[PDB]
Design an enzyme around this catalytic site. Structure first.
Site, PDB file in Angstrom:
ATOM      1  N   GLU A  35       0.827  -1.208   0.000  1.00  0.00           N
ATOM      2  CA  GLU A  35       0.000   0.000   0.000  1.00  0.00           C
ATOM      3  C   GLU A  35       0.862   1.260   0.000  1.00  0.00           C
ATOM      4  O   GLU A  35       0.586   2.215  -0.740  1.00  0.00           O
ATOM      5  CB  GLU A  35      -0.948  -0.002   1.206  1.00  0.00           C
ATOM      6  CG  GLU A  35      -2.090  -1.037   1.125  1.00  0.00           C
ATOM      7  CD  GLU A  35      -3.198  -0.627   0.172  1.00  0.00           C
ATOM      8  OE1 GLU A  35      -3.059   0.411  -0.510  1.00  0.00           O
ATOM      9  OE2 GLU A  35      -4.185  -1.373   0.069  1.00  0.00           O
ATOM     10  N   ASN A  46      -7.579   8.332  -5.343  1.00  0.00           N
ATOM     11  CA  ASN A  46      -8.351   7.283  -5.987  1.00  0.00           C
ATOM     12  C   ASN A  46      -9.197   7.881  -7.105  1.00  0.00           C
ATOM     13  O   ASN A  46      -9.475   9.082  -7.132  1.00  0.00           O
ATOM     14  CB  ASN A  46      -9.257   6.569  -4.986  1.00  0.00           C
ATOM     15  CG  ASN A  46      -8.500   6.060  -3.780  1.00  0.00           C
ATOM     16  OD1 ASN A  46      -8.818   6.411  -2.642  1.00  0.00           O
ATOM     17  ND2 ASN A  46      -7.493   5.226  -4.018  1.00  0.00           N
ATOM     18  N   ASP A  48     -12.294   7.789  -7.601  1.00  0.00           N
ATOM     19  CA  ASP A  48     -13.547   8.390  -7.177  1.00  0.00           C
ATOM     20  C   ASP A  48     -13.360   9.758  -6.538  1.00  0.00           C
ATOM     21  O   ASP A  48     -14.346  10.365  -6.101  1.00  0.00           O
ATOM     22  CB  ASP A  48     -14.282   7.443  -6.219  1.00  0.00           C
ATOM     23  CG  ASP A  48     -13.590   7.299  -4.883  1.00  0.00           C
ATOM     24  OD1 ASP A  48     -12.389   7.626  -4.784  1.00  0.00           O
ATOM     25  OD2 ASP A  48     -14.250   6.825  -3.935  1.00  0.00           O
ATOM     26  N   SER A  50     -11.634  10.419  -3.785  1.00  0.00           N
ATOM     27  CA  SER A  50     -11.082  10.302  -2.454  1.00  0.00           C
ATOM     28  C   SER A  50      -9.569  10.107  -2.544  1.00  0.00           C
ATOM     29  O   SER A  50      -8.988   9.990  -3.629  1.00  0.00           O
ATOM     30  CB  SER A  50     -11.761   9.159  -1.705  1.00  0.00           C
ATOM     31  OG  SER A  50     -11.377   7.926  -2.264  1.00  0.00           O
ATOM     32  N   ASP A  52      -6.212   8.064  -0.394  1.00  0.00           N
ATOM     33  CA  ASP A  52      -5.722   7.106   0.589  1.00  0.00           C
ATOM     34  C   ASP A  52      -4.513   7.697   1.309  1.00  0.00           C
ATOM     35  O   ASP A  52      -3.648   8.312   0.674  1.00  0.00           O
ATOM     36  CB  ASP A  52      -5.322   5.798  -0.112  1.00  0.00           C
ATOM     37  CG  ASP A  52      -6.515   4.992  -0.591  1.00  0.00           C
ATOM     38  OD1 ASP A  52      -7.653   5.253  -0.134  1.00  0.00           O
ATOM     39  OD2 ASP A  52      -6.305   4.088  -1.434  1.00  0.00           O
ATOM     40  N   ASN A  59      -8.812   5.412   3.523  1.00  0.00           N
ATOM     41  CA  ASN A  59      -9.527   6.175   2.510  1.00  0.00           C
ATOM     42  C   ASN A  59     -10.390   7.282   3.105  1.00  0.00           C
ATOM     43  O   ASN A  59     -11.084   7.073   4.104  1.00  0.00           O
ATOM     44  CB  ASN A  59     -10.393   5.220   1.694  1.00  0.00           C
ATOM     45  CG  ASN A  59     -11.061   5.902   0.552  1.00  0.00           C
ATOM     46  OD1 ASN A  59     -12.246   6.204   0.619  1.00  0.00           O
ATOM     47  ND2 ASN A  59     -10.307   6.187  -0.493  1.00  0.00           N
ATOM     48  N   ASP A 101     -15.155  -4.315   9.449  1.00  0.00           N
ATOM     49  CA  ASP A 101     -16.328  -3.835   8.729  1.00  0.00           C
ATOM     50  C   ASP A 101     -17.086  -4.948   8.014  1.00  0.00           C
ATOM     51  O   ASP A 101     -18.114  -4.676   7.389  1.00  0.00           O
ATOM     52  CB  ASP A 101     -15.913  -2.747   7.730  1.00  0.00           C
ATOM     53  CG  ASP A 101     -17.100  -2.051   7.091  1.00  0.00           C
ATOM     54  OD1 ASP A 101     -18.030  -1.661   7.834  1.00  0.00           O
ATOM     55  OD2 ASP A 101     -17.101  -1.898   5.848  1.00  0.00           O
TER      56      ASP A 101
HETATM   57 NA    NA Z   1       3.064   5.554  -2.377  1.00  0.00          NA
END
Ligand code: NA
Ligand code: NA
Length: 129
Positions: A35, A46, A48, A50, A52, A59, A101
């Site tokens: 990540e 991202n 959309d 948003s 990270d 997110n 979740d």
């Molecule tokens: Na990175």
């Protein structure tokens, strides 16, 4: 801060991620590597809109507030900038909610696509843990 592999493993285990919701420590180290490359300052937009944030690329659409994400829920009640600290406490605490979740670690698409079903114990081999 760019953590070392065993450095991050030790920090993650101290915060109790080892076997958290049944995920052994190597899963979390593997996820962080892909990540963020172990870099607390990592940010990635991202599609959309948003973004990270941090060591575990949490997110802004659902978990933290970054002030620019349409539809933000801020379920961890934290500014996303707090996820970039050299101290990983905020990231671990929010990740504990994410992994609870319902989808487990599949919530991290990098974990699903690059750690799940691999020898993830390799990511902590050699660490004095
Ligand atoms: Na990175
Ligand atoms: Na807990």
């Amino acid at each position: 801060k760019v953590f070392g592999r065993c450095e991050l493993a030790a920090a993650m285990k101290r915060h109790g991620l080892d076997n958290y919701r049944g995920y052994s420590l190597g899963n979390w180290v593997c996820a962080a590597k892909f990540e963020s490359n172990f870099n607390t300052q990592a940010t990635n937009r991202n599609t959309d809109g948003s973004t990270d944030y941090g060591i575990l690329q949490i997110n802004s659409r659902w978990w933290c507030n970054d002030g620019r994400t349409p539809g933000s829920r801020n379920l961890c009640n934290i500014p996303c900038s707090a996820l970039l600290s050299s101290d990983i406490t905020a990231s671990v605490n929010c990740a504990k909610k994410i992994v609870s979740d319902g989808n487990g670690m599949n919530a991290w698409v990098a974990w699903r696509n690059r750690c799940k079903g691999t020898d993830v114990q390799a990511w902590i081999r050699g660490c004095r843990l």
